[PDB]
Structures are given as structure tokens and as C-alpha cells.
Design an enzyme around this catalytic site. Structure first.
Site, PDB file in Angstrom:
ATOM      1  N   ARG A 286       0.840  -1.188   0.000  1.00  0.00           N
ATOM      2  CA  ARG A 286       0.000   0.000   0.000  1.00  0.00           C
ATOM      3  C   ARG A 286       0.885   1.251   0.000  1.00  0.00           C
ATOM      4  NH1 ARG A 286       0.037   1.156   5.041  1.00  0.00           N
ATOM      5  NH2 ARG A 286       0.743  -0.600   6.334  1.00  0.00           N
TER       6      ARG A 286
ATOM      7  N   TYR B 236      -2.942  -4.628  -5.300  1.00  0.00           N
ATOM      8  CA  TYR B 236      -2.409  -5.095  -4.029  1.00  0.00           C
ATOM      9  C   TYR B 236      -3.495  -5.004  -2.961  1.00  0.00           C
ATOM     10  CZ  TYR B 236      -0.158  -5.393   0.479  1.00  0.00           C
ATOM     11  OH  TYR B 236       0.140  -5.759   1.782  1.00  0.00           O
TER      12      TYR B 236
ATOM     13  N   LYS C 112      -8.580  -2.707   5.307  1.00  0.00           N
ATOM     14  CA  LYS C 112      -7.979  -1.513   5.903  1.00  0.00           C
ATOM     15  C   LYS C 112      -8.855  -0.301   5.644  1.00  0.00           C
ATOM     16  CE  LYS C 112      -3.882  -3.426   7.061  1.00  0.00           C
ATOM     17  NZ  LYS C 112      -3.798  -4.292   8.278  1.00  0.00           N
TER      18      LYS C 112
ATOM     19  N   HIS D 120      -6.412  -1.799  14.966  1.00  0.00           N
ATOM     20  CA  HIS D 120      -5.462  -2.633  14.245  1.00  0.00           C
ATOM     21  C   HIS D 120      -4.908  -3.686  15.197  1.00  0.00           C
ATOM     22  CE1 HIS D 120      -1.857  -2.741  11.233  1.00  0.00           C
ATOM     23  NE2 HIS D 120      -2.778  -3.646  10.956  1.00  0.00           N
TER      24      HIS D 120
ATOM     25  N   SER E 114       4.350  -3.025  11.663  1.00  0.00           N
ATOM     26  CA  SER E 114       4.833  -4.097  10.774  1.00  0.00           C
ATOM     27  C   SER E 114       6.154  -4.687  11.287  1.00  0.00           C
ATOM     28  CB  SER E 114       4.986  -3.588   9.348  1.00  0.00           C
ATOM     29  OG  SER E 114       5.959  -2.557   9.312  1.00  0.00           O
TER      30      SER E 114
ATOM     31  N   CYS F  75       6.691  -7.120  13.248  1.00  0.00           N
ATOM     32  CA  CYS F  75       6.702  -7.535  14.650  1.00  0.00           C
ATOM     33  C   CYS F  75       6.119  -8.942  14.862  1.00  0.00           C
ATOM     34  CB  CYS F  75       5.968  -6.511  15.521  1.00  0.00           C
ATOM     35  SG  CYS F  75       6.843  -4.934  15.709  1.00  0.00           S
TER      36      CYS F  75
ATOM     37  N   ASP G 258      -5.570  -9.352  12.549  1.00  0.00           N
ATOM     38  CA  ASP G 258      -5.416  -7.991  11.980  1.00  0.00           C
ATOM     39  C   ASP G 258      -6.293  -6.887  12.547  1.00  0.00           C
ATOM     40  OD1 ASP G 258      -3.783  -6.386  10.354  1.00  0.00           O
ATOM     41  OD2 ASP G 258      -5.207  -6.346   8.696  1.00  0.00           O
TER      42      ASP G 258
ATOM     43  N   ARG H 100       2.519 -12.494   0.391  1.00  0.00           N
ATOM     44  CA  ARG H 100       1.378 -12.812   1.239  1.00  0.00           C
ATOM     45  C   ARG H 100       0.737 -14.149   0.947  1.00  0.00           C
ATOM     46  NH1 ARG H 100       0.179  -8.583   5.321  1.00  0.00           N
ATOM     47  NH2 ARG H 100       1.562  -6.897   4.553  1.00  0.00           N
TER      48      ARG H 100
HETATM   49  C1  LIG Z   1       4.776 -15.060  18.659  1.00  0.00           C
HETATM   50  C2  LIG Z   1       5.887 -14.856  17.934  1.00  0.00           C
HETATM   51  C3  LIG Z   1       6.347 -13.534  17.453  1.00  0.00           C
HETATM   52  N1  LIG Z   1       7.767 -13.292  17.140  1.00  0.00           N
HETATM   53  C4  LIG Z   1       8.755 -13.198  18.091  1.00  0.00           C
HETATM   54  O1  LIG Z   1       8.605 -13.348  19.306  1.00  0.00           O
HETATM   55  C5  LIG Z   1      10.148 -12.900  17.576  1.00  0.00           C
HETATM   56  N2  LIG Z   1      11.310 -12.771  18.239  1.00  0.00           N
HETATM   57  C6  LIG Z   1      12.212 -12.490  17.142  1.00  0.00           C
HETATM   58  C7  LIG Z   1      13.681 -12.234  17.357  1.00  0.00           C
HETATM   59  C8  LIG Z   1      14.315 -13.619  17.339  1.00  0.00           C
HETATM   60  C9  LIG Z   1      14.538 -14.129  16.061  1.00  0.00           C
HETATM   61  C10 LIG Z   1      15.113 -15.388  15.912  1.00  0.00           C
HETATM   62  C11 LIG Z   1      15.446 -16.102  17.055  1.00  0.00           C
HETATM   63  N3  LIG Z   1      16.013 -17.385  16.800  1.00  0.00           N
HETATM   64  C12 LIG Z   1      16.810 -18.048  17.671  1.00  0.00           C
HETATM   65  C13 LIG Z   1      17.305 -19.397  17.203  1.00  0.00           C
HETATM   66  O2  LIG Z   1      17.138 -17.625  18.782  1.00  0.00           O
HETATM   67  C14 LIG Z   1      15.212 -15.585  18.354  1.00  0.00           C
HETATM   68  C15 LIG Z   1      14.637 -14.313  18.510  1.00  0.00           C
HETATM   69  N4  LIG Z   1      11.630 -12.489  15.921  1.00  0.00           N
HETATM   70  C16 LIG Z   1      10.351 -12.739  16.224  1.00  0.00           C
HETATM   71  N5  LIG Z   1       9.282 -12.829  15.299  1.00  0.00           N
HETATM   72  C17 LIG Z   1       9.563 -12.661  13.862  1.00  0.00           C
HETATM   73  C18 LIG Z   1       9.176 -11.226  13.394  1.00  0.00           C
HETATM   74  C19 LIG Z   1       9.497 -10.927  11.895  1.00  0.00           C
HETATM   75  C20 LIG Z   1       8.400 -11.430  10.921  1.00  0.00           C
HETATM   76  C21 LIG Z   1       8.044 -13.101  15.786  1.00  0.00           C
HETATM   77  O3  LIG Z   1       7.133 -13.198  14.986  1.00  0.00           O
HETATM   78 MN   LIG Z   2      -2.279  -4.993   9.278  1.00  0.00          MN
END
Ligand SMILES: C=CCn1c(=O)c2[nH]c(Cc3ccc(NC(C)=O)cc3)nc2n(CCCC)c1=O
Ligand SMILES: [Mn+2]
Length: 603
Positions: free
Chosen positions: A78, A224, A233, A253, A275, A277, A300, A394
Site C-alpha cells: 500500500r 495489491y 484496511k 489494528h 509491521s 513484529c 489484523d 502474502r
Molecule cells: C509469537 C511470535 C512472534 N515473534 C517473536 O517473538 C520474535 N522474536 C524475534 C527475534 C528472534 C529471532 C530469531 C530467534 N532465533 C533463535 C534461534 O534464537 C530468536 C529471537 N523475531 C520474532 N518474530 C519474527 C518477526 C518478523 C516477521 C516473531 O514473529
Molecule cells: Mn495490518
């Protein structure tokens, strides 16, 4: 006349107001044909087949009824720039900032929008079929209904997943009102410009417009989903947030999940994240803690309204998940992986030679001789210096297919929200979890949200691109909830999964282990004396967070609150809110800004 262009359904069986909306826009857009969508499996099969013939979709033979759309690279996200709300007065849409341009939305005058509309829509569907999509946001049976007109069969098929769609919606609508939704890819035939991957767009004239007084959404030039799936949205966040402000409820959201402890006690939590997260990963998280259960209501959008006992009830107005694909695996999101096994549309992911999907972080070793085609339809290796899937690619998947879909996900009563979680991606300074001191402070915590995109930006309530009206007023509306009679206000929390050590390594393992944080929230809601006071709110008291079964966790650095960091933080927050919200900043928020610098001053 018009009847002769109808290739499915009948004008006569449309309610007069639906018919008139269709008549006016057919006259304007000049489509070759009109297809009134019924929402049947048979219709879906037909549109999928047609799209395969035309090059819009490929079949993913590794799976049961999965398909892949590849887009023009110019049309992949978007565009905030080109997303506008139209009102008589600018202040009703965005606050007038103290300096700079507003980052809290984009306003267009009625006059400018009428000019912009006439330069785009007349004749825009020439050579194409106009599809009529009757859709319900929320369970079929009061809920809000819309009618989307589109020249995109990709939009039709995606709407069928993401909303309740078809004949039953027209039946439930009767002569009720509906949100008028108009969409065109902006490429009338004969094509005046090259077609990339058989994907029509008009990036130069892309415009996503909202006219709240007319109850109209008008979208030009992009296929998109954030720009084309007008229920999502555009309606369920932007227009609805406005309605909610007027009618005393909330459109947010937020993901919604239900969490159950080992003794069978169940709470629903809503969470807003910017985003990158992992919204969806948390929405259907498989928890690591023995005896705990997590169930998904939505990933969402949440509509939240006080019931007669003052509980904030949430409904997920959507019918599906439109999830970010990259980073999805059996490890990071086992529930998403099972969901997407069938009846799923994928967009801009890579394809294996056996007709499977692929993306960064899928974590699935290729079989012998299996190769990868990228999302730009090229042979791909890891040595290319370029992801096999677009970062914003997606999956579009039925919510009913999620193995932990909540039993009350379609309850018209909604689910009682006992806790609201705000969060962001913050490499430094922000502890893994904290609790608001009060409702007013919780509103401030939402208002103060910042997140790493390598830039850290403000994204209050995760609503920055989505406010349907003045953010100052949105803040006043949130504050007003503490004066709802007998309100049972959710506890408010802030989380950060993404804190790093000095070498940039994540301090918290996250994913399934986030159940340990939800456990703390859960018990706090129940009054557990498990807090320790800090200037920023309550954190877990020492030894209160369950670490059983984890390796070493540097709890001291993870929960560390530095005066220097928080001096820099509150200065930045004050600066942002006073400047951007200006005359519309509620004085309760001014008080919270002062109270925080005062608490920080004392350390
Ligand atoms: C309920 C889970 C939510 N979560 C998290 O809680 C999270 N924590 C992290 C950071 C992280 C990334 C990889 C590892 N891997 C290892 C092997 O330690 C650990 C922490 N990334 C995360 N991600 C990925 C976000 C990008 C799309 C994530 O989605
Ligand atoms: Mn969203």
C-alpha cells in the site's frame, strides 16, 4: 440496455439501492460485462480457471487448491502517499501540525478529489468485466455490509476468503444501507501500456480514497490487497474508526487471541503491533508452557464495543488471514503452516519445481533436484543477492482452516477483552514487558509507540497509516472510555520481543516462549502481586517470570531501564506528540508526558 451486459445473476434480484449504485458506476466505468457475484464454490472454481488461462494465477500442484499470483513489481504494497481521506475540513481528518507535514494521515479537499476522480474513472473498465461483490464484515447477521465493484477477478477471489461474500450477503442486506466500494486497476482495454506478469496496475494514478460522509471508498490503479480489498484496511479500520468514534465503540489494528491456563481459566487479549513484529505469529502462537492453550480470533482487525456489564467485546470483522509469508515456518508459526495447506492464494512468493511455495525463512530443505523460481519468474539461487520472495509477499487463507481457530471467533456477541497489548520492534532500551499504571497512562503508552523499520519511526496504536479522523480526537475518544458507566477497562501492557545485546543478538527467544510473558499478563489481570515499580510502568518482580525449561536469559539487561535512554525517549515522545497533534492533543496526554519526565527525573 444494462441487462444485456449481465453475464451472471439478475438486476431484478438486487435491492434498489445496490442496483442504482451498480447502474451509476457501470455508466461511468463502461465495463463490457457485469458479473454479480454469488460466492459459490462453483463461481470460485470458474474465476480461478479463468485467471489461470489469462496468466494471473498459476496452480500450486503440491497442494489442495492453492494458487499463486505474481504482480507488477511497482504494485506490491500500500502507498501511504496515495492514500487519502476526503472531508470539508482538514482538521476533521488530521491535526494541523506545529512544523512539517502531518504524519498522521493524508487529507484531500472535496474539490481536489472530484478533479482526481474525473481524471481516472470515466471509461476505466472498458474491455473488462465489472464484478459486484456483496460482502459482510463480521458474521453474517448483525456486522457491516458493503458492495465492492471491481474489474479484478483476483480481488473477487481474495474477497471470498477475507470476507463473507455472495448471495447470502445480499439476502441479509435487504434494503439496508451498505458502504459503497469502487475499485479499478486503471487499465482499460486496449492496453495503453505494457502488462507485466499479466498484472494490471496504474502506479502513476494510484489513489485510495475514503469519503466518510458519503460512505464511499474509491480505489484506483492498484491490485495489491491493502489497496484493493476494500473491506479490510479501507473500511474496517479507516471508515469504521470514524463510525466508532461517533457511536461509542472502537475499530483497531489488533489481533485477538484466547489464552487458557492449566486450570481451564480463559482470557481474551487484543494486541496492536506495527509491521515486522510478527502480528500473525502471535495471533496463532503455539505456546511452549505445559498446560497452556492459545486460540486465534483474528490476526489484523478488532471491533470493540462495551456490553451492558461494561466489558469491551471484540469481533474480528474478517473471514481470513492475509499474512506476511516470509519468516513463516513450522518453527516460527506451526499453526499458519497447517492453515495454508489448502484453498489458499499466495502472492509474490517463490515456487519450487514440484509446484510448492518457497520464501525466506521457510526453513524447509529442498528435495534432490527441486529448484526455485523467484517471484519475478526467474530461476533463483542463494547466490543471487536478492530474496526469492518479495518481503511483503502474502498468503490469503480461510480463517476457518486455522487448527486453533477460537470457538467464539464468529460469535455475534463477541469476546470479552481483558487485556490490551501494545508493542514495537526496539533493539535498545525498551524492556521485554511492562504494564501501564492507569488507563490514561495506557493511552499515552499507545500514543508513544515507536518501531524499527534501519530507522525507528512512530506508529501510535499501530494506526499511523489507518486513522479515519483526527488522531488528537482519537486520543480523546480512547480517554473517554474511563468515563463509560461501570466500564471494566482492560489492563494495558507494552511488549518488545526484539531487544538485542551489544552484538545485536536477541535477548529473548520469543515465538512459543512468549507464552511466558502472556502468563505474567494473565495473572496480573487476576490481581497477582507480581509487579515491581519503575518510572515507565510495572515490570515483572524478580523471579516472577517463568523461565523453567529455557537456557540462560540475561534478565538484567532485558529488563534494564536506563535514565539516559529514557531521557532521550520522553524528549522524543513529547516532541512528536506536541508537534504532530498540536492543538488537538488532549490535556490528559500532556499530563502523562509530564508525569513520565517527572518519574524519570527522580532516578
Ligand atoms: C509469537 C511470535 C512472534 N515473534 C517473536 O517473538 C520474535 N522474536 C524475534 C527475534 C528472534 C529471532 C530469531 C530467534 N532465533 C533463535 C534461534 O534464537 C530468536 C529471537 N523475531 C520474532 N518474530 C519474527 C518477526 C518478523 C516477521 C516473531 O514473529
Ligand atoms: Mn495490518
Amino acid at each position: 440496455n444494462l441487462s444485456a451486459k449481465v453475464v451472471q445473476g439478475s438486476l431484478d434480484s438486487l435491492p434498489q439501492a445496490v442496483r442504482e449504485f451498480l447502474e451509476n458506476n457501470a455508466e461511468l466505468c463502461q465495463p463490457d460485462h457485469i458479473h454479480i457475484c454469488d460466492g459459490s464454490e462453483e463461481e470460485n472454481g470458474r474465476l480461478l480457471g479463468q485467471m489461470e488461462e489469462e496468466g494471473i494465477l498459476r496452480r500450486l500442484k503440491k497442494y489442495d487448491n492453492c494458487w499463486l499470483a505474481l504482480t507488477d513489481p511497482r504494485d506490491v504494497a500500500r502507498i501511504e502517499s496515495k492514500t487519502v481521506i476526503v472531508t470539508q475540513e482538514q482538521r476533521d481528518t488530521v491535526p494541523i501540525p506545529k512544523t512539517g507535514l502531518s504524519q498522521l494521515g493524508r487529507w484531500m479537499s472535496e474539490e481536489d478529489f472530484e478533479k482526481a476522480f474525473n481524471a481516472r474513472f470515466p471509461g476505466c473498465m472498458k474491455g473488462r468485466t465489472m464484478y459486484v461483490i456483496p460482502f459482510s464484515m463480521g458474521p453474517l447477521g448483525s456486522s457491516k455490509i458493503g458492495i465492492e465493484l471491481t474489474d479484478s477477478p483476483y480481488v473477487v477471489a481474495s474477497m471470498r476468503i477475507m470476507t463473507r461474500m455472495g448471495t447470502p450477503v445480499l439476502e441479509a442486506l435487504g434494503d439496508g444501507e451498505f458502504v459503497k466500494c469502487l475499485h479499478s486497476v486503471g487499465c482499460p482495454l486496449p492496453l495503453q501500456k505494457p502488462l507485466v506478469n499479466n498484472w494490471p496496475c496504474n502506479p502513476e494514478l494510484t489513489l485510495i480514497a475514503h469519503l466518510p460522509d458519503r460512505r464511499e471508498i474509491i480505489s484506483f490503479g492498484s491490485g495489491y490487497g491493502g489497496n484493493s480489498l476494500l473491506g479490510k484496511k479501507c473500511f474496517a479500520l479507516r471508515m469504521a474508526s470514524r463510525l466508532a468514534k461517533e457511536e461509542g465503540w472502537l475499530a483497531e489494528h489488533m489481533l485477538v487471541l484466547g489464552i487458557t491456563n492449566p486450570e481451564g481459566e480463559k482470557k481474551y487479549l487484543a494486541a496492536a503491533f506495527p509491521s515486522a513484529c510478527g502480528k500473525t505469529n502471535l495471533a496463532m502462537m503455539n505456546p511452549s508452557l505445559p498446560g497452556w492453550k492459545v486460540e486465534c480470533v483474528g490476526d489484523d482487525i478488532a471491533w470493540m464495543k462495551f456490553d451492558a456489564q461494561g466489558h469491551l467485546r471484540a469481533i474480528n470483522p474478517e473471514n481470513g488471514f492475509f499474512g506476511v509469508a516470509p519468516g513463516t515456518s513450522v518453527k516460527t508459526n506451526p499453526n499458519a503452516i497447517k492453515t495454508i495447506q489448502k484453498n489458499t492464494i499466495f502472492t509474490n512468493v517463490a515456487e519450487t519445481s514440484d509446484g510448492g511455495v518457497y520464501w525466506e525463512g521457510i526453513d524447509e530443505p529442498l528435495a534432490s533436484g527441486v529448484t526455485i523460481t523467484s517471484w519475478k519468474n526467474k530461476e533463483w539461487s542463494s547466490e543471487d543477492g536478492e530474496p526469492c520472495a518479495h518481503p511483503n509477499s502474502r498468503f490469503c487463507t480461510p480463517a476457518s482452516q486455522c487448527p486453533i481457530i477460537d470457538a467464539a471467533w464468529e460469535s455475534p456477541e463477541g469476546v470479552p477483552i481483558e487485556g490490551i497489548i501494545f508493542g514495537g520492534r526496539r533493539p535498545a532500551g525498551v524492556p521485554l514487558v511492562y504494564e501501564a499504571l492507569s488507563w490514561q497512562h495506557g493511552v499515552f503508552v499507545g500514543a508513544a509507540m515507536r518501531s524499527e523499520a534501519k530507522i525507528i519511526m512512530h506508529d501510535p496504536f499501530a494506526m499511523r497509516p489507518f486513522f479515519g479522523y483526527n488522531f488528537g480526537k482519537y486520543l480523546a475518544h480512547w480517554l473517554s472510555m474511563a468515563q463509560h458507566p461501570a466500564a471494566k477497562l482492560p489492563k494495558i501492557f507494552h511488549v518488545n520481543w526484539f531487544r538485542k545485546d551489544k552484538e545485536g543478538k536477541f535477548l529473548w527467544p520469543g515465538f512459543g516462549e512468549n507464552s511466558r510473558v502472556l502468563e505474567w499478563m494473565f495473572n496480573r489481570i487476576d490481581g497477582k502481586a507480581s509487579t515491581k515499580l519503575t518510572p515507565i510502568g510495572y515490570i515483572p518482580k524478580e523471579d516472577a517470570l517463568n523461565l523453567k525449561g529455557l537456557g540462560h536469559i540475561n534478565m538484567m539487561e532485558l529488563f534494564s531501564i536506563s535514565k539516559e535512554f529514557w531521557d532521550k525517549e520522553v524528549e522524543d515522545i513529547e516532541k512528536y506528540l506536541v508537534d504532530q497533534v498540536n492543538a488537538d492533543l488532549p490535556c490528559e496526554i500532556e499530563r502523562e508526558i509530564l508525569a513520565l519526565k517527572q518519574r524519570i527525573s527522580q532516578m
